[PDB]
Structures are given as C-alpha cells and as structure tokens.
C-alpha cells in the first residue's frame, strides 16, 4: 500500500508551555504583538459574550497548568484567516488556566452558523485543543450553548457521538459574570463526566 | 475569509504517543479513559489562522539577542534550522513557529522552576520564526542542558527544545519536542519512550549539521518537520 | 438425555483476542475490568445442543439462490467450503455452522446500515449448513466487499464473512471472521490486530482453492475451523 | 511440552449478528425453522417462568445490539440435546435486545437440579454466553433464582467466587409480568456492579 | 503542424512481454516468425495527436454514472488514480488515458460475453481523462471481479482494468493492464506470465492507497505509468 | 551503465478492445465525441480515397476482434496533430475489424511526402498499429501505394528491408468502390506473406 | 493458495512401448488374457464396424512406433467399465501402428449418443489416447463419423473448436473394406491439417 513520509510525533507541551505560548500568563516580558485570549474588539459586530472554565484531571483536581487554542467562526458564520491584532475580530487566540488563575477566560461574540462538508448547518461551537504536562498529544473539542438547543439537536457532528448523555458534556451553561453575558465550560479529562474528545 | 477546499491525511495514532503512558507519571490522571470520536473534516478543522502579518521583531527567532541585559548568554552556540514539508513533501510556506528552552544549565526562566543549575542574565528562552516560500525557518539560540523532574527518583529530560508549528490548519497543529544527536540521556526519558516505534523517536532528534556552521563562530543542527499531508478534496457529496 | 463423559482442552486466552482491545474503539466501555472466575467443567458445561434433527430448507447454504426476487446476485461468485476439526485432528460431525456477510459492495441487508453502496435485490447474506461425517461443509456465495466503519476516521474493514459454529458443546461454541487471502485491509484492521499474535491471524484467513473451483464457473477458497480439543474423563474423584 | 493444533481464534459477532443469528429480531424473512427464545411449549413439564433482562456497558449506558444463547436443564434436572421444534421442551434458545426491544426476553421453565462432577448439587441454574459488537471474545454467566437462597447458598460453582457481594450479581430478582412468574437478570459488563463471568 | 524535434528512448523488447508465449494460446497463431524490421525515427513516429480539444463529457472519467440508468453500481467503489512520466521522471501533460473493464462480477458489457455472472444495469464500464498539467489522471469505478475465460481447463484472468495511453507521439502509445494488490490470481494468469520478468509484473500492480480514499465512501487505488523516455535530439546529419 | 526508469509493459487490448476504443462497433451507446475512421471530411483538399482490409492469423484464418490506429501526413504532407471533430482533416484516427464487418475501412485522402531526418523523401504512406487479442504487444507497420511505384522505389524505409519480396507486403493494391477510388491492405500476421513489422 | 500433492510427471513410451502394452504386435510370446482390439465380439449389439487409420509425424512421414488406446460407448450410448475379455463388448481397447502394419485397426461398433454434463446431447464418437516415442505426455482427440453430420453440427464439443476449418480433422471418413462398414482416421500430430487435440 502507499506509505508517505510520516508525520513528526507528537510530545508533552510540559509544565512550562507559558513561556512561549503564553508569555504574560507566565508573568515573562511580552514582545510587541501576542496571541492572547479577545478574540473580538469592543466594536466588533455580533453578541459579545465572555467564555470561562476550568479543566480537571481523572481525581477531580484542578489542572493548573493548561493552555488551550480556540478556532470559531465571526458572528456572520465566516472564518476569519488572516490574524491581524488590528482586526475587529479575529477567528483565533489562546488563553490558559494558571497557578494564579484556576480558571481560563476568553473575550469574544457567539459564532453564527458554518455548514458540514455536505452542505448540513452545524450548530453555533468553536473548536478547542487543550495543551498540558501529561497531555501527550493534545485534545479537541468542540463548545457548543445551552441557549442553542435547537439547533444542537440536528447538528450532525453532536449527532455523530452516540449516547445522549455525552452530548451534554460538549454544551456550555449560559450565566452573566458582571452583568455580561457569560458561559462556564469546564473540561473532565477523565472519569466520571468525561468531555467527549474528537479525532479528524 | 477562509474556504473548505482541503483534506487531510488522517493521523497515525500508533505512530504518535498514545495518552495512557503509565511510566510518564502525570499522564495517568491526564489521558482520557472513552474513545475518542471520529468526525469527518468540515471547515471549522481544514482551516486555521495564517500569522503572515503578526508584527515580528527583529530578534524574535535570535535567542542569543532577544532577551539581552548587557551581554551574551553563557553555553554552545547554535543554530537551529531546517524545513517544514507535508507528508506529500510539498513545503509549508508562512507558518508560524515557535520554540522555548532551558539555559546552559538546565534552568527555565519561570516561577515554578526551582532546581538550582542558575538563571542566565542575558537568555529569556523564548523564539519565533515564519517560515519563508519554501518552507525554511532558522533560529539562532545556545545549547539548553539537561535536567532532573520528579517522574522516578533519578529522572533526567535529555536536554530539548520545544516547538509548536501552525501549519495550514488546526488540523495541522502540532506541539513537538526536539532532541540532539547522541545525547545518551534519550533511550532513557521516560517522556521520549511515550513514542513506542523506535522509527518515531529519530524524527525528533536533529543532527549535527556542520555544512551550516558558521566557522570560528556557532554550530549547526537540522531539524525537518512533518506535517499531516495536504490535498484538494475529491469525488465528494457526488 | 446427554451425559457427562468429555472433557475439553482449556482455551489459551493469549492466543484468542483479549477482552481490552483499546484501537478497536467499541471495546473499551464493553471489556470486564474483573478477572474472569475459572470454574471446574460438569455437564453444564460439557453438553450442548445437537442440530441434527433441524429442518434446514434445500438452500439454505446456497446464497445464490435463498434470498430470491428475480435473479442470480451481482458479484464474484464463489464457493467457501472447509473443515471442523477439534485440537487432536478429530471432525466434528453433524455440527452447526451458520455465516452471514454484506453483498458485494459491502452492504449489509440490515435497517441500521446506512452506507451509501446499495442493497443488491438477490442477495441476503446468510446461510447455515450441517457438516457431514466426515467434517465437511460448503456453502455458495458471492465475494463481500469492504465497508468503512466508524471506529478510527478512515477505517475500513477487511473483505470478510461472519461464522458461528457450535460444536459438540457450549464450551466448544464460537463465533469467528473468516477474511480473504492477501487482502491488503487485513494487516490495518483493528478488529484483525485485537489478536495479539501473528501466527493466530493467519488462521482466519481463507485460501485461493483452484482445486475446488468449478471451472467456467465459480471459485473457491478452504477455510478449516479449529475446535477445542475433546478428551474422555480420566482418573476423576480417584 | 505437548502442543495441539490451536483453536480458531474469536472474533466480535458484530452489529449485525442478527441478520445471521437473530433474522426475525432484524425485521428481515425468516426460515421455516429458527432457533429461538421459547423453550417451552404450553403444554410442558415444570414451573413455567418468564426471564428477562437488560445488559448495561461501562458507562451504565444500554447495550442495545446484544445477543444472548441459553443452556439448560428441564424440570426434571436433565439436558436435552436434541434440539427439535416440535418437543415440548429444548434445553437450548437464543434472544437478544434490539434498538426497538432494549430487553431480552426469554419463555421457558425453572430448571431441575444437576450435579457436578464430583457428584455434589448445583443451585437450579440457566448458562448463558453473551455476544456483541465490542465483545472479541464472549461472555460466560449464568443465571441463579432469588428465591432458591437453601440450594444458592450450598452450589459449589456460586461458592468458588470469593466475594459473597459478587454472588448476589448472578441472582434474579423474582417479580410477575400480567401474573405470569417472572425473573429479572440485568448483566453489567464492566464498572460497579459487574456480573461475574466464568472461564472453562 | 507538427515538428521533428524529439527522439525516443529505445524500448526494451526482453522487459516488455514478447510475441510468442505459448501458455497464452491465442498468442501462438497471432505472433510473428520474421524478426521485426529496425528503422530510424523519423517524424512519422515521433508526433501523434493531442487531445487537448476533444470535448469530454463531464462524467467520462466517472464510472459511477456516465452508464446512469436511474441509479448506482453494485461493488467496491474505488478512486483509481496516479500520475503518467516519462523514463526521464518528466510528467506527460494533456494525454489521453482510457480504460474499460468488468462489472463486479466479472461480466464485460459486450454480446460476446456470455459469461453467467449478470450485467449490472447501472454499470457500463468505460472512461476517459485527459492528464493535467502535472500528469495526473483519475478515474472513479467499482473494483471489477475475476472471469474465467477459455486458455486452460480452469484459467481464472485476475481483476483488471485495461488501460490505454497515448503519450506524446505514436511512438509512447501503449496499451497496457493494471492488477490490484495481493490477488492471488496475478502470477497463475498465463497473460500476466507472458512477462518473463518478476519486476516487470510488479509496476502492473496498483497498490492500495488509503491517503487519497474518502473516508466512509471509497477506497483508492494508485497505479503510475511510465511511458518511453522523451529527449530532444543533438549532433544529427552531423 | 545508466538505467533509467523502465517503461510500463505492454499487455494484450484483448478481446473486448472494442468497448473501450470501439464503442459504436461492439454496438454500445456511444459518447458526443468518439475517435473514429472518417480521417477527412467530404471537403478536405486531396484525392479522397477509401483504404480496407482484412487482417489474417497464421492459419489464414480472419482475425474478427482487432482494432488498428492510423497516422499520416495530410495532403500536403503535413502532421495535423491538435485533433478536433470540427476540423476538415484529422492526422489520427481508429478502426476495427468486428464478427459482422471482417472488414475494416477508412476514409481519408492520399498522404502527401514527408521526408526522414536526413532530409530524403519518404514514398507516401500512412503509418499502422495493430491490437488484438492474442497480440501481446503490438504490431508496427507502414501501409504504401501500387501506384506510387517510383516514389516506393527511392523510399529509404522501404529500402532497409533486405529481401525485396518482403517489401511487397507493405504495397496496398488499388481498386474502386462505387466510384470512389479504393486501396486494400490486407495484414498477414504469421507465416506465408507475414506483412513486415517494424520496430523504431 | 491450497496447493494439493504434485501428480507423477508423465515420461514418454518410448519406442519399445509394444513390449508391455502391445505383446502380440510386437512378436512376443502372449498372456492368457491381453487387452487388444477388438472390443465388440461378433454377437454384440449395434452396427459393426472396422476403424482404420495411420499417424503422421510433422514433415509427413508416417509414425511407426506409436500406441493408442480407445474408449467408448456402446450402441445405447453407456460407457461399460468392467473390463471382461468374456462380454461380447468391452467400451476400452488398444491398438497400435507396427513398421510391418504401418496402419492400425480396431473391430468394435457405432457408440451411441451420450450427454454432456449440463445435459445437451453430443455426437457420436471415440475418445482416443495416443502415444509414442518422442510425445512426453500423450495427445487426447475424438474420433466422429461423417455419416453424423446432423448430429456433429449441434454437438457442443466440436462446437467448442473455434475454427470451422479444424471441426474437420476429427471426422472419419465412411469406406467399406471387405463387405464391411469402414471409417478411415488419419492423424497428424504436426503441420499443416493438423488434428485437433483435447485438454481436460
Ligand atoms: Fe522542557
Ligand atoms: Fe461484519
Ligand atoms: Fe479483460
Ligand atoms: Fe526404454
């Protein structure tokens, strides 16, 4: 059969990802431009909400050293590609949970609406890789709103996880942090209340 | 904005690590015990961002100048240099990569660091390199030592590098470990052996490159990566 | 009424798949985590159901024929004929052996397959047949296809057919695959590497029989199936 | 040492073991003769009973694709081999759960005592293997009535197990289906709760 | 018009299979006794026609549906694809290739083939592609199955596809056979015997290649071809 | 020595040639553009001739499954090599031979004179390959005119074939077809008469 | 693939073959009971005939040497395999051309029609068998007879023979020779009319 040339493996992130992942999260001098976690200026069109979660590992504890990259599309359903930090809104950025921070947090607005490879409507998600010591290759996920559970039911991916009880894992609950429209979406590595991880 | 006009070569997930890896302590409580779930390549996983315009600074990819307090760091000088291709060989042009290592010493400028080789005035430890059209990107950094963790009672990471490389996509993405030709401490990590096929481990070990050196001034070592092969989509929904 | 005169040889649980077969997705949430409780053989054991008096239809090891609505089904015509033999090199006579497959494009005739290769109207992929004195059993039927499954996100698997044989006891019953000598799928199936052992894999593999084909007409493969061995008691309770 | 010709390795039944093993329970044409979950005839010797049950994977959710062989003995603590549709009793029988039917159910008689080997009495009890996607190889059990705790208590194969928690595993609760006496055997696969499984 | 400005590698009459190879019986009364006459090249066979303005139909290269009788063929769907080089390793741009084959079963949609295996009223088997610019053609199909045909008593043709390319002149024109990977058939078939050499029959073989399959729809096949050598001329007439 | 890559070997077209090539002659639905035996349209400049033949085994028995392709000059001796359907005249074309016409024809016009790479004139001719069942690789050979018999005679082509008796099989012999001037070349492939074949 | 254990390699008779097979024709003393040439004794039922033919090797000369050995139905079309010089027919001999008998002969009767195997009706005829020095492995044909001539146009073995021109070589010609019903088979192994031969 066809073998190519095979892919470089993948290795741990290990402890100290932040410092050159996440420069101010490891409280290190920062250079000029960062990819941080606002993905969306305060003058960018659509909802703004405000995302928040913390990560735990198979015991219950709290992982305190992850660092997470998130890929949504703008509130028009489009993928924004060219990172520019004077963008309006940017599709990407990355965030962390650190020593200090238990909890991660992202600025940004609800993503509208992209279709399947089959021309199907997805639901509203944004695409999370979650990045730790002990973490060998990292994991995706997707995140999905509770205040979106029509569309959740005929998403074709949430539909392709075949227990009902693991959908729930993947959706995040709607809350209001200082009165901004806010949602916790915490993340169970392992065990009991495991998020539903993805491959592609 | 982004379109949907690639796929990409699915991953061996033989050839990489698995997450359960019990003699690397940490990844016990950290590697899910459910399967994960197949899910077929849409828009949201054949695109990614593209850093061509991210503001980069002069030194960004020189780690013997980034950091600097009035002098040149202590340790081996080196240049790290090589090409990122997929798995077609076809080179991956304006492709962000980053890397971030210890000091001569073993020591990582960061809070929780507390082994006692010194922290280096002059050297932050942190890189960054868009690669040119043809895929090649170089850095210019100093040799990082060694050190002990708590995994087993006598536990040494071989001395490494870190790197994280975009690619076209978040498909693509990939956060890797660099290690240099012969160090004996490699057969021994138990971090390195999270890869069981042996073939696996060389491609993270980059070789003395002496065609690259500068003479009377730094070493060299080559570093080539591997990313998921690209391709158009075919034969699709009819 | 059956009596208790037999004693079977233990199976080797390192030569059969192990329950944990962690690539093979749908195992891990379906394996035990207790270990299995090893209890001495009685006749609950050592007995089982003889089938010799089943009214079995005059095709119902034909699959050319059984289904019927017109015609002959489309696909490679061939017949899969063999032996059961126990561990001591013993046939196993008058013994049920029940197969059943997809057509020939991998379709199974079954509410929940979904895949888009389309039903054939002749054909309905299954059929049973009783060996002879000797061992023997044959059947008729078209080639399956391989169908991509849900597991990994580009698994396929192998061309095969499903057997079900009961042998002279509940102890001695399996359910097995048979696959197709040299097909390339084989060496990447997770359900073929759920079997630790090479040498265990090649016993599933049928063989090209050019001595059993008909000529202008049809081919053939052999495939013999391995019953535990039976033994008489000997010097039980003293 | 001696080796033998070693036994054809096992492979998973698959989910589609009913289009083989179980055409009716696939809504597909059935045979003149299938082996099926009447044991029993009306007009048969002994307590007529009902059996049923539920099998639940590790994440205590349905396992809905299950199929399921029974052995055992008549009323009179015999085996009948010859397997005929016409007896009023067959030793043997097949059923299975489907996505319509997520519960087997079986109709048959409680069975007569048999001995081991060593001529000691077993508790009445139905042998049971279970099969499914998932499954490489299958499953061993057997299943022992509530309310036969004398005989439950004195079974040389229930008292191999050593734990007295995991015998109760392989204890059928009694109850009445339309006043028609019922038992109820639920098998967990893995987890809390885990059915005891046998080698032989 | 055409120029004389190319010449062509010789070809390689003991690599190719020869004339008389008496196990293929029909070769014996359709082989030449003379030797094959030498003569120079010259424009007459160094130019051929050039495709580039045939007008294909959308669907020619398609076999799923250019034969289209309200629905699908029953098989293995499957992508057969690779590129055409020249012995120089140069790709062959804008060529025709053209391939016919059997149906699932073996049957060819032709009045002479009585074979008993049916036709498949939504298969016709034909298909046309003109390269691209790089050399890379593709085809979609089902996998065709084995057919007996009249050489010896019991002779089984492998599956296969034939294939035609035309290349740059009438001089590359080749008519040729791809076989899959792991048949069991391909070295028992007298026609693919009629090759002496052992790795000459290796380059018919297309092998599977899973890189270019869609996932949860078909497999693909990669089969390369290479045609004569193609160099431009020097020191001629001196 | 230096080995380049070796060619891909040739198999034989076999005996359904005509499905993939002959589409109209194995009397299957054809496709809007089809390589056919119609090398010039009415309207082409030229003398308009019809070629046919019969192609022979060694037993001189009819060869009814083969299949040939042509390439000549036009009029003016030139080689019209961008194929179109819409052109006057086409260098290249297709015929066959089938079980109900034993027979093949072309229609074309005379090839004017194109001279070899040293710069001498070749006698007209049009330049034949031949497939079929049987044939393993196939057959290359050059059809010429009895009517051009002094050109034929300083042809340096012609004139590479040692024995001049060999050289008559390569002359097609003129005739007429309801008026229209005709040559017949009929092919020997084997034994008494075996038409030359050449190798380049 | 199944390969089964390799049958004997054949070598030829070689030109002493008369010595074991053919003791009378080749002047030696005689058994009691020797298989020969005369299958049918005077009182058997169905036409009596006298069968005569000479083999010819490729450059037209006659073989001298060789041995054939026939078999075939009786006159209701059965094939008797009991072998007893004491019935009045026997469906096997042998015969053999002698340098004294350049021809051989067999005494026997017209075969009746037997089926093939999907149950078409063949023509009438003898299989023979012939062997020699210089054939490694001995030639099967068929003798018919040209009286059959309704019968050998719908037989389907010789309709198996592809070519028209071939069917021929297998007819024996009607003669008479003394008063009786005679049908001459000549054979040539090589050449121009060469006999067809059989592979089964
Ligand atoms: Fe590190
Ligand atoms: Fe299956
Ligand atoms: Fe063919
Ligand atoms: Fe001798």
Chains 1, 4, 6, 7 share one sequence.
Not at chain 2, 46 to 66: E, K, V
Request: proline share 8%.
């Amino acid at each position: 059969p066809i073998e190519l040339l095979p892919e470089t493996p993948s290795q741990t992130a290990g402890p100290y990802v932040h410092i050159g992942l996440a420069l101010e999260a490891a409280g290190n001098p920062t250079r000029d431009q960062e990819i941080w976690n606002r993905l969306a200026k305060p003058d960018a069109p659509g909802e703004h909400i405000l995302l928040l979660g913390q990560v735990y590992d198979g015991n219950g504890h709290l992982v305190r050293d992850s660092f997470l990259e998130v890929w949504q599309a703008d509130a028009n359903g489009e993928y924004q590609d060219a990172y520019n930090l004077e963008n309006a809104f940017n599709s990407f950025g990355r965030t962390a949970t650190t020593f200090d921070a238990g909890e991660w947090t992202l600025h940004t607005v609800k993503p509208g609406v992209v279709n399947n490879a089959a021309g199907v409507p997805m639901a509203p998600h944004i695409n999370i890789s979650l990045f730790a010591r002990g973490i060998n290759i990292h994991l995706h996920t997707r995140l999905y709103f509770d205040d979106e559970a029509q569309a959740n039911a005929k998403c074709p991916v949430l539909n392709l996880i075949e227990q009902p009880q693991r959908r729930e894992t993947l959706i995040a609950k709607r809350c209001e942090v200082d009165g901004k429209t806010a949602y916790r979406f915490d993340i169970r590595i392992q065990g009991e209340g495991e998020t539903v991880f993805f491959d592609f | 904005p982004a379109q949907d006009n690639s796929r990409f070569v699915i991953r061996d997930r033989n050839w990489h690590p698995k997450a359960l890896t019990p003699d690397y302590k940490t990844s016990i409580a950290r590697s899910p015990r459910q399967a994960l779930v197949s899910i077929p390549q849409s828009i949201s996983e054949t695109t990614g961002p593209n850093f061509s315009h991210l503001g980069f600074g002069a030194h960004d990819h020189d780690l013997l100048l980034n950091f600097n307090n009035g002098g040149l760091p202590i340790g081996e000088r080196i240049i790290v240099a090589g090409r990122v291709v997929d798995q077609y060989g076809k080179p991956v042009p304006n492709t962000l990569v980053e890397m971030w290592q210890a000091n001569a010493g073993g020591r990582c400028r960061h809070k929780n660091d507390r082994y006692l080789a010194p922290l280096d005035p002059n050297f932050g430890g942190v890189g960054r390199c868009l690669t040119d059209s043809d895929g090649y990107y170089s850095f210019r950094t100093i040799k990082p030592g060694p050190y002990p963790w708590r995994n087993g009672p006598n536990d040494w990471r071989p001395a490494h590098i870190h790197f994280g490389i975009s690619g076209p996509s978040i498909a693509t993405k990939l956060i890797t470990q660099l290690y240099f030709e012969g160090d004996p401490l490699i057969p021994m990590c138990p971090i390195v052996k999270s890869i069981a096929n042996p073939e696996a481990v060389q491609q993270l070990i980059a070789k003395l490159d002496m065609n690259n050196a500068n003479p009377m001034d730094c070493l060299a070592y080559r570093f080539d990566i591997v990313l998921r092969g690209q391709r158009k989509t075919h034969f699709e929904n009819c």
